[PDB]
Design a binder for this molecule. Structure first.
Ligand code: MG
Ligand code: MG
Ligand code: MG
Lengths: 189, 165, 189, 149, 149
């Protein structure tokens, strides 16, 4: 007997002896849940590490050309004491208008000599065609003058020429948390 | 075996996929910049080995796993496939027999030559070639191929050289 | 209290009694890793079983027609002592030129009377449209004169007519390992 | 009778071809740093003791010398502040910058040229110079790149 | 004040007579490997640190030098990439290739000549050069050959 092997009246049964047959391991069923917008995951930063983010408005891009923009930080972390601060894993993603002309991509590498050449070498690349319009520079830039980054632009290409402020781009960046966040200021100056 | 209520998490470009290297076996890579390719034809470059490991000392080394991915301008002209085989007599013949092959229509445009070359002289590679084909013709430097290989550490980074002979 | 149920000052809380509600079992998250070319899997053969492989160059195929080719083994295993050898699971896959005309498929069955008819009956089928251009004849041909196979051709169809040597095809085949592999030869002949 | 590097320290070397020069005058050349380490990432690494030596054609002019110092305003004056110097007249055509730079941004040196003087004017690619530099080995060193790009 | 070899390492040496040369020019010579080790068997052996020095007639021209590198396309350029060099002007007329080749096919070197330059042109067999090379001792070393042939 085995599965629902419960009937009525007699009914013998025999099998055969050999070297088994079925697969060695057995099955497990599953059910991929359908996820909606934003349900994703915004992994938390790490130890004593802050994640400073902010965006930069786009520049009128052309046909199939690709522009660049030395990225600069905000006044807060723009302190010589914080400039020489260390960074962690970091990502870039981009918010853009709904009515978009063609599909396009974007990345970031050391102040490239050749602007288009960037895409031939960057670790990750925010692609529009992809479901995830963003790139993860995990350990890619871990450790670096929180100023170093300045000399190092970001690259963006477009299939169809396009306007400026036509799209922003955020940069969630891991970096050691400063000390300002806490304590006030010396009353005695 | 009750079903497992699971949930595929979204993967964003350059995420995870950390690729640990083997012990003692150090991985070193670089790249050769494409030379203009015609439409549908497939070029091939001998192994653009780096001088860093040209010394017969290390050139007489061995390998194992070997990656190969590529960077192409956003203005990528259609699609292209790439790979590597034994100084293939026929150019296109290489694609008819490599263990792996990076393609532009693949989520991950790269090829993993898993052990397929394990135990081969580091020099043993130069008698190899890298083959790349393109849908429509295209320029040179238009694409870069990245030979990511692992092998071993020698006896030099270890130290400098003769002060006074 | 439960999740982050740590606040300030008082703030009571009560629920309701019924017949529960939520699903019976609970969730598990995952992350499908992105695999590249060749990372796949080349399952190892089995006990005392060798996997002899080799390829056969193509024949100029026509429009939508499908050719065939009595497959023959290599001299080594072409011994009457090894001819009457047993086989295991076996697969066929194919390497072909990059610049390909249309998509096409291929399989293998007993020296078919009708060449096209093969595709209506073979266990597996190397399809080009598929991500896996190969077929697995697991147990499909397990057990058989390592010669039997001879009488039994292989079939290939093409959407667009095409040249010869236009493509090869390998046959990784499981079969009992012979004895030559080891010991040398009787010095005394 | 050999030599050794340091703990967790790599010695990256390479050469730079000479640009022809005039006699008695001394040229300079910002550093041709190796791309592999041009990443602000490791470009901001720690260096150790470092040395420079030079291979040059046999058939070469009068005995000349060469060193390295901060982006020196005076090409010739760089030899008065040089820590060590590769002299041709010496039996040792090289200079040891031990602990002279021990502990500095791998990208620091960039803002710091190399100086070479010559008795008789001389051709380009007429002589090379190698730079055996101690620096902490970085990360990736032993693990591939995420295929997912 | 002496020197030592390595563990299970033999130091096979021998010399090669110079072929007359022209002044200022520099010749080359693939390696005259010793037959005893020309057997692909040990020819595929591991080498260690190795040195070259040179005995030459007393009565000899202007101070000249010599080294060794991969089959160099440019005879003269081999001296810019040379690891160490035997200079005559130096008190040490020899070059130490310690760990420079440490670990290489005993048959590798073959595809690698030796370079020599001279101030004044000079005769053949006018100077020899010895090669003290570290390499793992092979097998037979201590046992006869089967008489049964
Ligand atoms: Mg700094
Ligand atoms: Mg039979
Ligand atoms: Mg003196």
């Amino acid at each position: 007997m085995s599965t629902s092997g419960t009937g009525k009246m007699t009914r013998a049964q025999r099998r055969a002896a050999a070297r088994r047959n079925r697969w060695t391991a057995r099955v497990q069923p599953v059910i991929v849940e359908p996820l909606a917008a934003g349900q994703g995951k915004a992994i938390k930063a790490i130890a004593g590490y802050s994640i400073s983010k902010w965006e930069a408005s786009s520049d009128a891009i052309t046909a199939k050309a690709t522009n660049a923009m030395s990225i600069t930080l905000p006044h807060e972390l723009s302190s010589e004491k914080n400039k020489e601060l260390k960074v962690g894993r970091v990502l870039l993603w981009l918010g853009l208008l709904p009515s978009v002309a063609g599909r396009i991509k974007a990345c970031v590498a050391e102040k490239q000599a050749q602007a288009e050449a960037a895409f031939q070498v960057a670790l990750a690349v925010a692609d529009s065609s992809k479901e995830v319009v963003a790139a993860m520079y995990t350990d890619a830039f871990r450790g670096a003058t929180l100023g170093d980054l300045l000399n190092l632009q970001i690259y963006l290409y477009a299939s169809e020429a396009v306007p400026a402020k036509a799209v922003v781009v955020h940069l969630e960046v891991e970096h050691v948390r400063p000390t300002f966040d806490d304590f006030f200021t010396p009353v005695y100056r």
